[model samples]
Target: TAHALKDPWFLSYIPQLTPDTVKYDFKGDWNKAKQALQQPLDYIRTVEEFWSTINSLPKLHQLGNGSTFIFARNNVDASYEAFPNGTRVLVDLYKASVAEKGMDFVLSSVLGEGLTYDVFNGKKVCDVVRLSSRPNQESPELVRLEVWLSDQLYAKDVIPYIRKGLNEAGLSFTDFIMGESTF
Candidate 1:
């Protein structure tokens, strides 16, 4: 009965599974789970942490005279901050439209005023590009170069590139607009 299913603990000891054994696929049907089990809190927590850090750092322009931009080492742990109060982020849609071109560049340019060809880890990462204003705040604050990849699909490539790419771009650690300290 719905009444019986309403018990909060009903799922705790159901059948032969424990909560930990549920094997969250992270990428599954949203309707399959109830509210509490929806979005992975761990991922959300990390994301909040990332944003918090970015917000807490000194404003990007303060770091240097040039446009300020931020990038992170991991997707689950990256962010950006641009300088000039209204600096626009432009991206190379042509470079990001196909798998062969690599999609990681899509987000790195989130706040870039401009980009250029560069070499990193032997990969021909986006030589030059820029970040356009976010189409909408709800969407990633990045250019809509093409269809967006799920966080799961872009996590590995995107995040790592942000981390390393910043250095290649001649940005410094201080340039990172870290999130606030939640501690």
Candidate 2:
């Protein structure tokens, strides 16, 4: 188990952040840039553990302008690279300023990727739900919710759950297409 990361993850926090909280381009030292996150609030393994902790925490809007909550595999440093391939997240962006187009609270909660899509004939969709949130890149007025996926390509089978999960959680998004800048 030492060489691999299983279901257990860290519910980490980054205390005061700014729109310009840039991930620096260092010469040789890299881990220093990853220190923005404080010690994790908790460690989660069981499905009950995740809900138990998250239920007590504040929703995205309740946190301060820069307060962030991230769920990542292992206690590995927080970064996109912390998330390898095999599991890809469907990220949705929303501005805190608009309630109409805001995030669906339950969407970010689905854990097992293999759950059904909520209808007859709906088979299991995905497994291993990995989620994280952050203040908008270069724009403090926004927040993004990202969900993990196992498949390599996108299409009708996957996109529905992205919507189903988000809306089932709560969704109406601005866009799914993104550059590395805000994934």
Candidate 3:
């Protein structure tokens, strides 16, 4: 017998063979595929988008007083090592006190307002104030008067000012967290 005929499967399948062949289809629209993959939600993907959304919100009040209050994380060299992450709050006072007495003036003013040692866990901790610009610069104004406190203290001692719009009170902690920090 021939080698081809000697195969038992070949001999048996010879009668079952079909004349039809397999075919493939590839006619998808690239444009439709791209559109389907695009994001649909109005999510904030960039810094500019985040700020634009915040700016679009209604304005509650303006910083009309001489002081400009800001709440900052305790990232200062000394405090950064001492406190738990994100637990330290620094209240920055700018253009609120006289430049002649420098930070001393700002500290005294803040301390004089009844925010004493008892208010800060019975420890008379001093604040750290610094200038935004150099002394010889054109605008040699006192830039920042920072009072460092724990997050607990801030909520108990400072939430009133936030509610009253003392330092851009309209700007909430959520807004600051979303705007300044990233996930």
Candidate 4:
């Protein structure tokens, strides 16, 4: 039952977080760096729209080393100052291929099938999930997935779905967090 998002979700990204992988150098030029992005913000109010929008973009691994693609629900502005003082369910996604499989599965379940709708105390666990990839100043790749829950204490309840997504995708992730991330 793909339905409308309870609260519209905003998708945005920085085309390049740093110039280490590219020939051009931002070199502390914040203005030029800010101009590098074409789509600063886009809203997806339903599951189909979410798929359409996401399908238009490159995969997380296909993007540049420093690039990030974030889809957050209302009130999550994503700025450092805007990070809510609430719990963020950090799901670990290591390799690029596995990352895409896990993310696609979970995102589809949560938004498309609504399989994760009320696993948290009879209410929707959260309305947002963010996907980003980084080389972490090293050659090794890392993909980050965050499921944001505002002031929710039942972060544990959301774990099973994450497990299911990864498992069904033929991937395994034993390390994850329910609070602020170390990386």
Instruction: State, as a TM-score between 0 and 1, how close model 1 is to the true structure.
Output: 0.20
Query: By lDDT, who's the top model here?
Result: 4
- Model 4 residue 45 CA deviation in Å: 2.1
**Candidate number with the higher TM-score (1 or 2):** 2
CA lDDT of each candidate?
A: 0.26, 0.47, 0.28, 0.63
Worst 10 residues of 1 by lDDT: 5-14
1 against 2, candidate with superior lDDT: 2
Compose the digit string of candidate 2's lDDT tens values, residues 1-183: 232223576777765443445444333444553454455588777666765775666555456655666665554455545434434444545554332232333233344323344421343223333333454555454555544443334324455655555555444455333222222
The global Cα lDDT (0 to 1) of model 4 is 0.63
Evaluation by TM-score, superior candidate among 1 and 3: 3
Ranked candidates (TM-score, high to low): 4, 2, 3, 1
Clash count of each predicted structure: 22, 8, 0, 0
* TM-score for each predicted model, relative to the true structure: 0.20, 0.55, 0.28, 0.68
Candidate 3 per-residue lDDT, tens place, 29-80, comes to 3333323322222233333443343234221112111222221212122223
**Model 1 / residue 73 / CA error / Å:** 25
The superposed Cα distance between candidate 1 and the true structure at residue 16, in angstroms, equals: 53
The candidate with the higher lDDT, 2 or 4, is 4
lDDT string for model 1 (1-183, tens) is: 111110111001011112332446233432333233322221111334434433443322122222222232221211122111211122222211221122233332431212212312333222212222222233232222221222223233544445455446544554332111110
